Amino acid sequence: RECISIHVGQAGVQIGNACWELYCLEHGIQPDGQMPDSFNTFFSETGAGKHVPRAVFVDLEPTVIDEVRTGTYRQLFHPEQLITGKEDAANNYARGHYTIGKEIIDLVLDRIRKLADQCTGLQGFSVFHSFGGGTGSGFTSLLMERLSVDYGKKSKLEFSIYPAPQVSTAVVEPYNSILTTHTTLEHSDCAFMVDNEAIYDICRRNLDIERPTYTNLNRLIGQIVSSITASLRFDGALNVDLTEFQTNLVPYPRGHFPLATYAPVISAEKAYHEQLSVAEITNACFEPANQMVKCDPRHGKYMACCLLYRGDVVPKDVNAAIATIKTKRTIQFVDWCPTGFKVGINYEPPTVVPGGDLAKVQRAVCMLSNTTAIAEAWARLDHKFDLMYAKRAFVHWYVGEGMEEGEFSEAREDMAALEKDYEEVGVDS
Amino acid sequence: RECISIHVGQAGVQIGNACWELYCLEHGIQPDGQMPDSFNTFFSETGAGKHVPRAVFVDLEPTVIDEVRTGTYRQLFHPEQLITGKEDAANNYARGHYTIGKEIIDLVLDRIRKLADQCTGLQGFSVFHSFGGGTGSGFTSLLMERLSVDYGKKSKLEFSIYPAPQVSTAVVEPYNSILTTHTTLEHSDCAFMVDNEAIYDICRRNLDIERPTYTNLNRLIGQIVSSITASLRFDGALNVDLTEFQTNLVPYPRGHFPLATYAPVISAEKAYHEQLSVAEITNACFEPANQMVKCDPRHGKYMACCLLYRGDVVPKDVNAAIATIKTKRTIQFVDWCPTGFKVGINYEPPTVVPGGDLAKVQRAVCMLSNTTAIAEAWARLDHKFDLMYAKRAFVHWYVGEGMEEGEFSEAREDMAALEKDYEEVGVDS
Amino acid sequence: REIVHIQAGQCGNQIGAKFWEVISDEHGIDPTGSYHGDSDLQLERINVYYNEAAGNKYVPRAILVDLEPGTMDSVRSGPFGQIFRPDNFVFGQSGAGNNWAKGHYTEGAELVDSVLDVVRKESESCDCLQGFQLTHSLGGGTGSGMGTLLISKIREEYPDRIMNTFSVVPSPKVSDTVVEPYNATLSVHQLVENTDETYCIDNEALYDICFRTLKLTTPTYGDLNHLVSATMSGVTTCLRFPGQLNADLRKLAVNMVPFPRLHFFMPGFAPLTSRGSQQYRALTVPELTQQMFDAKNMMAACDPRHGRYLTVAAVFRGRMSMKEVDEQMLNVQNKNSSYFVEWIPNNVKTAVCDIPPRGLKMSATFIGNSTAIQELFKRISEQFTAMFRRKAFLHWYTGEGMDEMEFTEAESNMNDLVSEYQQYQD
Amino acid sequence: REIVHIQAGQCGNQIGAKFWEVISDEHGIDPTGSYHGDSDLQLERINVYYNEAAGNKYVPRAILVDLEPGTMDSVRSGPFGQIFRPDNFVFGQSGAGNNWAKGHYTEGAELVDSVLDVVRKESESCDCLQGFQLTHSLGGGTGSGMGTLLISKIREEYPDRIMNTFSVVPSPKVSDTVVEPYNATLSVHQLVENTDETYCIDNEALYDICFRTLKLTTPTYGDLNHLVSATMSGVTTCLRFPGQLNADLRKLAVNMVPFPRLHFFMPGFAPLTSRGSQQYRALTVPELTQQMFDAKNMMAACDPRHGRYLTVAAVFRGRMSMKEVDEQMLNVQNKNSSYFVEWIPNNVKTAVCDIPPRGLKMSATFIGNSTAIQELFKRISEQFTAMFRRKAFLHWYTGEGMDEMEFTEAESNMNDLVSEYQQYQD
Amino acid sequence: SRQELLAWINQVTSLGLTRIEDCGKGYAMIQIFDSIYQDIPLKKVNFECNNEYQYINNWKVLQQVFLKKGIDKVVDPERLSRCKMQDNLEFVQWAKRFWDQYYPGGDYDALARRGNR
Ligand SMILES: Nc1nc2c(ncn2[C@@H]2O[C@H](COP(=O)(O)OP(=O)(O)OP(=O)(O)O)[C@@H](O)[C@H]2O)c(=O)[nH]1
Ligand SMILES: Nc1nc2c(ncn2[C@@H]2O[C@H](COP(=O)(O)OP(=O)(O)OP(=O)(O)O)[C@@H](O)[C@H]2O)c(=O)[nH]1
Ligand SMILES: Nc1nc2c(ncn2[C@@H]2O[C@H](COP(=O)(O)OP(=O)(O)OP(O)(O)=S)[C@@H](O)[C@H]2O)c(=O)[nH]1
Ligand SMILES: Nc1nc2c(ncn2[C@@H]2O[C@H](COP(=O)(O)OP(=O)(O)OP(O)(O)=S)[C@@H](O)[C@H]2O)c(=O)[nH]1
Known about the structure:
This is part of a larger assembly, with two copies of chain A, two copies of chain C and one copy of chain E. Chain A has helices at residues 9-25, 63-68, 93-97, 99-118, 134-150, 174-184, 196-205, 214-232, 242-249, 278-284, 315-326, 375-389, 396-399, 405-419, 421-424, and strands at 3-8, 55-59, 82-84, 124-129, 157-160, 190-193, 259-261, 302-311, 341-345, 363-371. Chain A is α/β, with parallel strands linked by helices. Chain A folds into three domains: 1-258, 3-Layer(aba) Sandwich (Rossmann fold), CATH 3.40.50.1440; 259-373, CATH 3.30.1330.20; 374-429, Helix hairpin bin (Helix Hairpins), CATH 1.10.287.600. In chain A, strands 3-2-1-4-5-6 form a six-stranded parallel β-sheet, sandwiched between helices. The two termini of chain C are 38 Å apart. Chain C is an alpha/beta fold. Chain C is globular and about 60 Å long. Chain E is mainly alpha-helical. Helices cover 58% and strands 0% of the residues of chain E. Chain E has helices spanning 2-13, 27-37, 52-69, 77-80, 85-102, 110-114. Chain E is globular. The chains are: A alpha/beta, C alpha/beta, E mainly alpha. Chains A and B meet through loops of A and loops of B. The site of one guanosine-5'-triphosphate has 25 residues of chain A, from α1, α5 and α8.
């Protein structure tokens, strides 16, 4: 195997409710928990009728976790597993990590130690957080922190929603994201990344809708994610374990962050049009306008991709569609890497929301990868930071929250060697 | 295979809707896309029960493409394939080519690269534009321009509707047509030409009607065109590929422009009269009052004709009806050309609109050809230009649109050697 | 997409009421009501003149500029008067003195900023702006002065979007004012150098065309206005409709102005037959060109027959044969080769909408750029000098903070403008 | 979580009645009644302003401090006046003299302990305290003096919980008192050094914004107050609601104060359209930022256009696209790069609640920290010196046990405060 | 006209003035009076004046000069302080007339009087 999941921060919780929705939806388990091993690596068969989730929820304002215990699904989780700190969220790392966030952690852990025990030989914890938040950046920082020590012997794949390249929200965002990166870096196994803005494009350009509610982006990651755990931990013609990832996906200890991408994003109402070919979707994967991340392969050489397919797919079709790609060159893969294509084949096709806006094809490609591209995304996000730090901007908000000129300046230097790292492991031969 | 098609300019779009109509009409595919390979070289079997077109539509005012997505056929194309630039059309080359038209091109191309991929070993793009327009002259100029480079390895047959000899519309027309010729010249494979006015004559003299709506001329080209692609790319007793044309039709690299001609143009209401003989229609082809072009063979020696027949035709009937012609002498063919008669025989007879005004025979002759005749048509259209340029007339309208005294004067010199070219390749032995 | 009308002065305003009286019906928009449109096509392009707020209230996007309350308070207290959002009314309760100088330098100059303010609120409305429509009379304060300023500012704010100007050039025979040539010469000056399409109408060219081409015996102003508004509807709004061959302000502009002056045209409507009887229906088409191209029937004062044309734009709007249209135009171009200028092989710009004027079967607006209008600015320019020479009612200008070199300027300018126009008549 | 309002002085008090008049309805709390709330969400977070005793009686947790009975006896004898538990009324039947010194050192200093007493009874209410809201005017005794003391004590008792201050800085044009700059300069002094969020409102910035942005012809005080109270509801209470991206006093504080002075802001409401007509609904969003960010519409006296910004907090509250919100903010930040300070890549702090102002579809409170407010403390500071120089009505202060060095102190302090603020405008 | 007056004023005062509206500040009006009377408290006048409150002081100074001298001419500060063109144009025109009649032979140094401001 299983893989627990800790959805931290309002966002990580909204996305959580979403990814958690898509789940039962493709497993025939109504919101009442009941369906009429396989998928046991994400659901525990508690009592003799239901399927209590296999994760937890951590937010410091009740508002968001509250809504879960109102709307059907209310029945799905255990009243217990949804942790809250009535106190204050605070869009600031410090407070969430140190000062406040601290008080809850114990309790938090307890569940990921109480839920981690009940199972049978697990594989890790799929963590869901929103980089630039208070409860999402800070808190987790120490949650993943306390995990890397309590279970160093497992997988720590954290699924993040890192800062929109130009459309950020919080005024401080970078402070909170240069801080969640440096503290989690030395603790994660593989950090998946899905850019909030670069997903909108997909909603504008590859689905058409200027009315994208957060509830949609969530349905999307809620999809790409389903391709990761759900179906993969599910039997198939080319299974891929969680460990598999980090192994076939990270060339170096830095909790390396690949990018999530999905192939068939086409709007219902298009739903009837003749379906796309195995070749087209494959090709769609090499287009910088369909990757849930504003890290357009502006130069970033891929260094490992895990093409997770699902649905009706002939291994030759793949071991050909990929061959064609391996020789497009304009898709330049790293040097020190001969072949970096982990072909993951599942059976059961995707499963689109009954009536959202997702096409509903009979095959998809959730390809994720490490690309020297993020050399950018990190850069552009680091620079941000400086500008403000350069004037201390909202610094007094953290200091007064048990932090110091140290943690900032010393977490800046941190990422600095992440701009050099993602530079050295590539661009050079 | 196939042959994509890009209908550019309101006109090229009106004619497009027309040629596109005649199509399904003779392929049993209702406006709903559904019919109850062969013709796959113009229609993609999106699945599925439908027959999504195999072309695109480019206009800078919505008005005209809008009407397509109102009137049955609304169901025929993909909501996507009909490109528009809400902005401004402008009956001026410059603006359409440079300034405005530019912004759209990328996007435009994208489809002719997205639609060009989906297929299986294509042959080219049948382009539909109206020489003397803004979106039709300019834009295409660079569309065909960007094609000759992205697919130099194919056919570029552009089907034009060049300037009525005396009944032009736009005040500038020549500016726009001396400019679409020079820019496309070094990019097209074979440019078909259908004269708007010289088609009216046919509607007055060979069908009788002083009430010819544009919607008719369109039905006509909509016919002659059906004889080109449609039926030809369709099996027969003497198939003729697109390449075939340019090969058997252009003696020299100048994107040479043959003329389109049809044989059986007789009005319904005549519909019962005893049909015409294989000999008569053949002969009708050598009459300067039935050729969709005011280029009456005033002297222009043919240099290659592609007699495309369709319906019930005995090869001997042809390889005789043509023999009789080859010896009429008053039909003088070029010197350096022994035999210049590409006999294209199809099976399925023509298919007339249910109740327009086209007779509906059981055999027709859509003969097209390169005739030293256009030495005229170009001349008369070039002269026009000078008169105005000689005074700069509406020049400030282009200059202020990213053009220069260069592009005009240097595109004039261009055609100049098109008046010498069409002169040298003939009139001399 | 779009355009934003501008009702400068009283006249330009009075006409606003008629231009909108019409246009609305030609778009099924009742007073405050919505789109009752007999059809469904009179809506897909409305935007050009309205805005979406409620869902039944598409408000005309025009401006009402005037220094005389009573006026706008007559237009706002009558029929369609209650459709304009009050924000549109940019009044100047000051003394709307009949001085070009009083509405361009002293009184109007103040009210300007509070106008531009709105002309921006409307421009930045939505989608893409095309240009602005401008109505006024060149024979008064709020008209020639203040309206001629409104544009000089507009043309600095968006030297991209176009500027059609509908001017009521001072009729000959009798002047409905006294300084007329003063307020005029001064406004034409501003025109020849900002707006790029001007349609000059003459209260007496109308009477004529309205008392003999419409046996109409009591042609009230409302009428004249009504006739005019009929033409400006054929121009704009119309072309913002489908058509075998449609154009739009620019086409019209980019086909009609050979030389940057801006040049002024002379609009002419097609079916202009008296009610009952005349309803001859001789409108096959040769009948419309018969109409449009005759002397009388040119809203201008001057007669085409008195000077070549540079460009012509028959903007027809009613189902017809692109053949019987494209054709006619020709013979017309050959029967009168004499006057039609030669260095333009095809002066005429045939335009063809589809849907016609609501209740009619076939119409065709005419926008002529003839060199004949030389013989009008001449007129105006004459009247000036004959009175300038003695500085007649000049103290009402200077005393308002003007210049003795300002009047000189305009006359000359506009006077040269006469010159040039002849450079083509020859 | 929580907060505990503080109605210092008459003004601060008069406003209390309006801040609570509103807020209650924005929480379905009738006079003494309970939660009639049209919804169920206007209750899960009320605590922030009330207390549970009966089960239908959620009593506002504020303090009413004043040395003039008649006042609180007008607020307690009118509408919602009978919802405050009498314990809340900390009156001072003494002579509420208009002297800062009379309500800060001599008269108020006594009534203080009997206040702090309650401010503790309310703080130690329950759950976790966030901060205290403070309303008053810096142009009187019970306001600037006694209220400015109430805080100096509060900030010694819980230097942890925040302190928002709503000050009615002395309007320019005409002051509603004579010593005004005396009572003011002296209170701003206390502010710059205790509260950490101040929202300065100007009775005349309101009139304007209330007589031209609300064609309102007779803007009674009740109104002004009402408008103000509208903003302070968007700030606090609001954010104590859900939201795609919600903040709370601190976020607001920790995103708006670059440098410890405390800095003062200038609140601005969003939909501020006249009743009937104007009800344009042009509130898609670009319309709200259009609003909020214009000069007029800033409850402050000074105009933003007269000095960069350090921080901005558009606290919107009505369902909208985190895209059309996050986006707009940008262009805004680029169209005006000029004034928006640079050493802060993203000055703006976008905040987004969900539920909007009861009867409205979409609103957005604006809390600007612009350097423009320099040109106000300047004003105040000027008035002081011009009169201090002659010790004008100083005997009313000293004679009340004050110091000639006390006035010196404040001016300087607050005067330096002007200085600093410029250090960023450059 | 505006052009003529502005040219005159700029030369007399040694000012930059682009438009008549600039006169709304009231400084120039005070200085014009100073050239005639030389009684005006120039140091007090806010020559440079950015803000309206400053304008008011200039107006008060101007008003006082009128009163001291017994100058009957009306001064509607409310109109002028707005910096509206018409009101200022009219006032400036009157001032010029006043200057023409009143100004004595003695030379006037506008810069020095201002303190080179
Ligand atoms: N895809 C996606 N992104 C979200 C969602 N909710 C928020 N975000 C993004 O995540 C960030 C917001 O984090 P917040 O909601 O402010 O904070 P938090 O991380 O929940 O924790 P706190 O700051 O303590 O409240 C922004 O960059 C948002 O664009 C969501 O439902 N889906
Ligand atoms: N046969 C035929 N000719 C047409 C049709 N529509 C227009 N034309 C001719 O093509 C030319 C008109 O081009 P326009 O419609 O003005 O312009 P456009 O090429 O669509 O592009 P823009 O100038 O930017 O609007 C004229 O010579 C017309 O006679 C049509 O439906 N059929
Ligand atoms: N066609 C037409 N002409 C009009 C109309 N009203 C006025 N005129 C003409 O316009 C000129 C004067 O227009 P007028 O409306 O008085 O301008 P104004 O600026 O509003 O006038 P003022 O306020 O300075 S006195 C005269 O030549 C007159 O014949 C009208 O409603 N229609
Ligand atoms: N906006 C607003 N301003 C008010 C209100 N009441 C007074 N003011 C403003 O506050 C200042 C004086 O406030 P006031 O209420 O007299 O203070 P106070 O301390 O209670 O006065 P005192 O008892 O010493 S005389 C003036 O500048 C006045 O314009 C009110 O209800 N709303």
